[PDB]
Design a protein around this ligand. Structure first.
Ligand SMILES: [Ca+2]
Ligand SMILES: [Ca+2]
Length: 285
């Protein structure tokens, strides 16, 4: 049934739909009467909570004078009654006037928390491969949830698809041992595979040659270039930046040129690049 600000008036034409809606979205049934002075207080309050809650619950007004038989079916003892429905089943409710505060308390006890809504917005974005916009929702939701496991797993999954394996690892190390179940174990395996896939023969050999020659700018620069080949961009940038802090001519300007090519490749939309651009500017000028 179509709502206007998430209010529908119940009659025999829409009872069954609304009861069915209740399986997915909680429904606040409000048994009311034009003749009830108490309904005159309650009505305005319930309608504006129906506005302020943006579809998180539907208000189902049942006029008990116009719809006497539908009302007898619910088993009313007084008008007004307000009953929260979920799964076609009454959950909680009350009878008589109530301040806004008791109503919210009844509503918020059942409605999804901010972090759950955020997690669901993020899951949709991830559905649309928009991992990049899912990330801030998941960080937000994860903090709000006090770093709960379920959200944790989603946050790690997002960081992995974004090639932020280090960040994902840091999240997963957070998870209680008892929650290290199937999904978690798949994530840990992905990470190991990702790491292995980025640990190239050429990188391994250049690595050791810089471990033992921690001053050859040209060696560090070819390495940085290999790291870039496989998306290890942060390591490649920090290492090129280490040597630029010492000499801007490093390895005869190849350090600076490689540094700026990587930044070019990462584009304007990269937090990582944008960080390093500003450090570069401050260092050069
Ligand atoms: Ca378990
Ligand atoms: Ca400066």
């Amino acid at each position: 049934a179509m709502s206007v600000q998430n209010i529908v008036n119940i009659n025999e034409s829409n009872l069954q739909q609304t009861l069915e809606q209740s399986m997915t979205t909680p429904v606040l049934f409000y048994f009311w009467s034009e003749r009830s002075q108490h309904c005159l207080q309650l009505t305005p309050v319930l309608e504006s909570l129906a506005a302020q809650y943006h579809g998180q619950f539907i208000l189902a007004k049942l006029d008990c004078d116009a719809e006497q038989m539908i009302a007898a079916q619910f088993g009313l003892r007084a008008i007004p009654t307000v009953y929260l429905f979920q799964n076609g089943q009454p959950v909680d409710g009350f009878q008589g006037p109530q301040p806004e505060e008791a109503i919210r308390a009844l509503l918020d006890k059942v409605l999804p928390r901010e972090e759950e809504l955020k997690a669901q917005q993020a899951m949709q974005l991830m559905q649309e491969g928009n991992y990049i916009d899912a990330l801030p929702l998941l960080k937000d939701a994860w903090q709000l949830s006090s770093q709960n496991s379920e959200i944790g797993l989603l946050l790690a999954e997002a960081q992995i698809a974004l090639n932020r394996s280090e960040e994902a690892e840091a999240v997963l190390k957070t998870i209680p041992l008892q929650d290290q179940d199937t999904r978690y174990q798949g994530l840990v395996a992905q990470i190991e595979l990702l790491k292995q896939a980025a640990d190239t023969p050429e990188i391994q050999q250049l690595q050791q040659q810089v471990a033992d020659n921690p001053q050859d700018a040209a060696l560090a620069t070819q390495l940085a270039l290999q790291l870039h080949q496989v998306g290890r961009n942060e390591e490649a940038l920090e290492l090129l930046f280490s040597h630029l802090r010492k000499d801007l001519t490093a390895a005869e300007g190849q350090t600076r040129k490689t540094f700026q090519e990587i930044l070019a490749a990462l584009g304007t939309g990269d937090a990582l690049a944008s960080k390093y651009r500003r450090q570069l500017y401050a260092l050069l000028y």
